[PDB]
Amino acid sequence: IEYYYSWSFACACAAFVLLFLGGISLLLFSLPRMPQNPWESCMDAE
Amino acid sequence: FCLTLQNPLRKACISIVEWKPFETIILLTIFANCVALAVYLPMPEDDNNSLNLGLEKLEYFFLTVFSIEAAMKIIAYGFLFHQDAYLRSGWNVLDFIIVFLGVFTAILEQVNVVKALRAFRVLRPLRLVSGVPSLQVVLNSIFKAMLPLFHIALLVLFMVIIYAIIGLELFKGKMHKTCYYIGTDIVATVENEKPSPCARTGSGRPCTINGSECRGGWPGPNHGITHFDNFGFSMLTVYQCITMEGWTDVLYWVNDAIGNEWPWIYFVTLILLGSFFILNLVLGVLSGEFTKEREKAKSRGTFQKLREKQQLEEDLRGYMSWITQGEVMNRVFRWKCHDLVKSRVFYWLVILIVALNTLSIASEHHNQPLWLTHLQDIANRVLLSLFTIEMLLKMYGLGLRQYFMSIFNRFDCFVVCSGILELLLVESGAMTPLGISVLRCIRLLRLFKITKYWTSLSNLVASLLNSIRSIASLLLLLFLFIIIFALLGMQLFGGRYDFEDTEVRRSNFDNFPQALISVFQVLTGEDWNSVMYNGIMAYGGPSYPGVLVCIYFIILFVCGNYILLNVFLAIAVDNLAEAESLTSAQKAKAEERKRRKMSVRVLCHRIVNATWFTNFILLFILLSSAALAAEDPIRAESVRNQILGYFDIAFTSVFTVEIVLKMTTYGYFNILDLLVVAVSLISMVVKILRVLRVLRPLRAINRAKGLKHVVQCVFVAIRTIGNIVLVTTLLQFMFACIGVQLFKGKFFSCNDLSKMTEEECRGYYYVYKDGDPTQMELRPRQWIHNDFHFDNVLSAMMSLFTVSTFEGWPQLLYRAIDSNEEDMGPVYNNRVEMAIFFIIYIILIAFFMMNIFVGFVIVTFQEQGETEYKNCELDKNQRQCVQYALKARPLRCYIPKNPYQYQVWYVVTSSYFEYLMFALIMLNTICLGMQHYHQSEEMNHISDILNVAFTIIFTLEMILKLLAFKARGYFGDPWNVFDFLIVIGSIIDVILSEIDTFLSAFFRLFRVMRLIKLLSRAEGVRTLLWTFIKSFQALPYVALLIVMLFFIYAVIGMQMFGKIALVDGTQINRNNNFQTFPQAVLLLFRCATGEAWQEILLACSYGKLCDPESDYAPGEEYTCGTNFAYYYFISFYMLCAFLIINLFVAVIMDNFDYLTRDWSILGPHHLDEFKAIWAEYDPEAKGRIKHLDVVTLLRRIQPPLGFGKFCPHRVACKRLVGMNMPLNSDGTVTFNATLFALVRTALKIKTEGNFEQANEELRAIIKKIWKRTSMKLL
Amino acid sequence: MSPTEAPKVRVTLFCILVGIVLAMTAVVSDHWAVLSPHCEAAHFGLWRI
Ligand SMILES: CCCCCCCCCCCCCCCCCC(=O)OC[C@H](COP(=O)([O-])OCC[N+](C)(C)C)OC(=O)CCCCCCCCCCCCCCCCC
Ligand SMILES: COc1ccc(CCN(C)CCC[C@@](C#N)(c2ccc(OC)c(OC)c2)C(C)C)cc1OC
Ligand SMILES: [Ca+2]
Ligand SMILES: [Ca+2]
């Protein structure tokens, strides 16, 4: 009695790492972004 | 002074009494009492020597002397309240407090016949501060610099709390099981191993000791002190980790119990985040504060105090050189020795015989040949008389008087006199086995003679003597702090480290000298947690009051280190300032003097040139660097190591293709592209080449332009450190020699400390487990040598580097204090005066280290702004306010329409809401830090009643917010998104905890993250946070250098030491090793943080037991180790340190605008609040607003930006029309240009006709306008 | 158009289109374990054994 995963653990451990990290990167790619100057503000005119 | 209405002068000539010596008699009295609190000897269990009694008797005298003066100052001054005038001063309050407290304790004691009230006497030294009116001022500047650290304090406090709670849940009660011998109640552990958690079935570690089983009634990892059972212990352990001392210990215990797959995240993040980040922020704010203070001095009057007197001294020596040659200017050979002394022959042949005496000292080692000893003494003999004659010929050849004149000459007198003084001394017969040595080293002093020819050294020395002269008053305070804590130590811990074990605790507070050393030790932070544990055990253990002693150590460390900060920062700031100031002054002195005497081939370039080619190649470096890191060290016969070898032969065909195509078009960085490609094809001494195969990640420094330019800058930082490094490396060497003269052949000892000779340590001896005269095992006796010693000059030096990194320096210190005679084992507490050597070295090194670090900073500054100039009509404060006024912009408030939605919007935006929510989040916090290990079942369910009820409340606030922002403006605020995230997760958590019991320790972490909302209101913390979090993004290449550092090293590391077996009790084990890539990187981080790296270095040396998996001729298991571990480790340490100081400087500088802002006058902090009032007049931006709301805008403004605390009828009515503004249609004046003349008024204020001249300047020194200034010109 | 039609946000959003189906590949296929007594070889999943 042993254990071995071949077809659908490493599938979901490639869909975990996809959805967990394609979500955090979409988050940082979707926000307004850091202003980088005093005039710039997060969430502003335009 | 005079009361002006007191009682008459029937006795009130007390104000006559107090003239000159009563201020000094009392001072020496407060000094003698200090000398008395220190000669005291704390004895355990109530014993007492007859001298302590004598001291208590003298105590009464001391008391009566401090108690009458506290009445003779409420006589002078005036009545109850005029004495209050005495009390008016803050210091008197302390004086009164002292004496009062004293007699109080005395009387109490008497009546009884309290052992605590005696701990308040260690306060009297403070009184030594009221006296010296200088110390007062320093104590003042220390409290003012600490005022702007409030925002960082909040942050650090909340960081510890958050981590503490996460720690709590995460590992609360998971460390109570340890390996036990079966049936017995004894802990099973190897030799140099610490008892650690264990686990029966699971990810944790299992029992490995024979006849050992996993039990579970264990108090904890450090005598039940380090764990996460409640909020208090959790908090303590977290702070301990944040200080960076013993953090890996905690990380390993959590692994050993939960599995190593996840607890690493928590810890690394902590050390990184908390520790390093916080350090940066604190170093930054302080630096800023110091700069402003210096600026306050230099612009007031302090530049001309140090320029004149440095010029009036160099004009004095020029005046006195015009005299001393006029006074000086019998036979012919006495003039031929005048020609020679100043020549260039004699300069190159004083360096000849000084180099023979440096070589001899270095030559001195333990067990040296007989011809060597002979030769050394021979040379010194062939030199004492050679030193006799030149001195003899010098003082008689050019005059007996002006020989006295030379600073250098005075020392040449001292050499031969004490050089020949030891000639008959060592011959007399006294000396002994320690003096005949201290004499020998002195010969080292002759190198100083060369200083005479070393002009640089002479000056840099005065430069160094100036900084140490200014911080003189700060330094005294540091010592005063140390003495006081040493005394408090003697009081809480003196005579209590009396546990019935055979374990020796060298760091205690038994007497004054020892207590001093322990305090210094806790101050360097080396092993401070271990020192604290002893103190805790001295009060019963980790229980209620018993633990409260740990507050002593916390305070000590923290505060003492704050004083250290001041010292170092002050030294740097004053020092850096002088260097910029006088080096530039000697530069304006420089060239003003030198002006006076003067007065088919194309498509392969297309592909190579093409941009896509690069993104196709820089992800073959991303694959080939994953193939170096996936290699298996121990087993070369693996299928993994074979099938990665085909990935070797894949890519190094392709970089060949890149190479040959590159020499189809073109005919230093490309000799590196040739080398990498050849190495693989050759590798398919082979062993040596393989290490040189990790160089591939270094071929990506040319492809990217960002990387190329920063290795250039780093290489330029190691060119402006010459005179200082020279002084420093001279220091290291000299101290190494002193060490060899003091501890040569004295770092040897026996297994059982009974045998003192090598002859004696033969045979076998008994060892006793837990000091049980009934439980003993047999062991062979062996004469061992300490790993770090002072046998030769290359050894003493390695020792000093480690003592300089503060890693394991107390061990060395104690071995030295125990040193006996050459070839003889230790004698407990033999010579405690060696501690002096150790402490002085540490101090001097700290000083010189700082200077070198600061100089590197100055070079970088020159690379940046220091080199640059901007002499246009607009200064610093104009560029950071006008360019902001050009590039500004509107906002988005979203005031919506209608009463039902608008009213809802109002409740939620009301202050009753802010405060309420805040209060609720505070309560939730308090309810989280309430969980502990082993609570009740009624406590168990109301925690699920509450966590579902808090979710409710929060999901009920979000609803309101959503209803009041149509979901368009709700998800518009970056904080609302965070709110949403928290809510959803918190709910899922509840539902989970539910579907669990109806029929994931990651969701219970959503409760804790709520605290981050608090950061939504704190505007100073948020602001500071953003400021720095914004710089770490402007400099992403330096961080890349660090990353690349760890990568190369990890790879080389694996290769070099990836086969050493993981044996317990050693430094290479299951928690620390080079077996896998991730593990190697963890090890290096551990090293960068300075956690016992020197012990690792030794663990990675030659004769190490090989992993069973690795192959080897039956009889070669012990051939695995490499003495290359010395170059690897030292080099990694240094390079690492270098890169780190280069990242802090970078960030700090790029942020100096906000740091040294002097928030008084102006910043963008006024320019922010303008728009946040303008947001109430703009829903969305649109540019302009009505003119009816313009006058109501100026009523909302702070008066340093707008108009006063006066009424706006006269100044604010007249100025708004008279100062310029653009005139468009009736209710249209723009955002973009109203803010201009509103800040053009407040500073940079101009006369009429030249309204084009402000617009003239706003195009040259400013960036291209972009066409927006055409309304900001008019 | 700047946060929704940039390519850097659509490379990521197409990447989620891969993980939306690979997590659907897992949630129907029951192949992520092998019972191996030695025949009683069983393949576990969520829904079928
Ligand atoms: C912005 C400013 C920048 C400042 C720059 C400063 C940064 C300095 C860098 C220091 C960071 C230190 C990181 C330490 C890493 C700790 C890892 C660890 O200890 O794990 C132990 C273990 C390793 O297992 P193991 O091999 O010990 O297993 C043996 C099992 N026992 C112990 C029972 C015998 O945990 C893991 O398995 C996690 C895997 C590690 C993955 C984490 C990434 C590490 C860094 C990259 C290497 C990973 C390769 C690529 C991964 C692909 C993506 C998943
Ligand atoms: C391996 O490289 C490093 C490892 C750790 C650290 C963190 C500590 N840093 C060296 C800063 C310590 C320096 C400093 C602080 N803070 C400090 C000096 C002496 C100290 O005790 C006497 C002290 O440690 C408590 C801190 C001074 C110079 C400001 C930095 C590193 O690079 C410098
Ligand atoms: Ca340390
Ligand atoms: Ca340490």
mmCIF file of C-alpha atoms in Angstrom, chain A residues 16 20 27-28 31-46, chain B residues 883-884 887-892 972-974 1026 1029-1030 1033-1034 1164 1168 1171 1181:
data_model
loop_
_atom_site.group_PDB
_atom_site.id
_atom_site.type_symbol
_atom_site.label_atom_id
_atom_site.label_comp_id
_atom_site.label_asym_id
_atom_site.label_seq_id
_atom_site.Cartn_x
_atom_site.Cartn_y
_atom_site.Cartn_z
ATOM 1 C CA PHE A 16 -3.129 26.372 -8.046
ATOM 2 C CA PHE A 20 -2.867 31.930 -7.197
ATOM 3 C CA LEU A 27 -4.162 42.617 -8.995
ATOM 4 C CA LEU A 28 -0.918 44.565 -9.184
ATOM 5 C CA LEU A 31 -4.640 48.967 -9.700
ATOM 6 C CA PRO A 32 -3.889 52.583 -10.555
ATOM 7 C CA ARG A 33 -0.221 52.106 -9.410
ATOM 8 C CA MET A 34 2.100 53.901 -7.003
ATOM 9 C CA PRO A 35 2.221 57.611 -7.782
ATOM 10 C CA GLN A 36 6.044 57.927 -7.697
ATOM 11 C CA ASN A 37 5.790 61.704 -7.160
ATOM 12 C CA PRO A 38 3.977 63.898 -4.642
ATOM 13 C CA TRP A 39 1.355 65.143 -7.147
ATOM 14 C CA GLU A 40 0.415 61.633 -8.266
ATOM 15 C CA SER A 41 -2.193 59.914 -6.101
ATOM 16 C CA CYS A 42 -3.667 56.432 -5.916
ATOM 17 C CA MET A 43 -7.178 56.735 -7.306
ATOM 18 C CA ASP A 44 -7.430 60.246 -8.745
ATOM 19 C CA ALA A 45 -8.459 62.599 -11.547
ATOM 20 C CA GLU A 46 -8.709 60.307 -14.585
ATOM 21 C CA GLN B 883 7.432 71.238 -10.570
ATOM 22 C CA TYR B 884 4.687 69.731 -8.418
ATOM 23 C CA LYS B 887 2.434 68.324 -12.878
ATOM 24 C CA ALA B 888 -0.441 68.232 -10.354
ATOM 25 C CA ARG B 889 -3.978 67.024 -11.183
ATOM 26 C CA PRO B 890 -7.573 66.885 -9.898
ATOM 27 C CA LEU B 891 -9.238 63.997 -8.009
ATOM 28 C CA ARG B 892 -12.418 61.966 -7.580
ATOM 29 C CA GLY B 972 -12.491 52.843 -6.539
ATOM 30 C CA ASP B 973 -10.638 53.364 -3.264
ATOM 31 C CA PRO B 974 -7.640 51.044 -2.966
ATOM 32 C CA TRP B 1026 4.474 54.938 0.997
ATOM 33 C CA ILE B 1029 7.850 51.597 -0.360
ATOM 34 C CA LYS B 1030 8.159 53.955 -3.312
ATOM 35 C CA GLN B 1033 10.888 50.518 -6.514
ATOM 36 C CA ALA B 1034 13.074 53.275 -7.936
ATOM 37 C CA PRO B 1164 3.751 68.844 -0.310
ATOM 38 C CA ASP B 1168 -2.009 67.620 -0.554
ATOM 39 C CA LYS B 1171 -6.637 69.319 -3.285
ATOM 40 C CA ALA B 1181 -11.870 67.240 -11.998
#
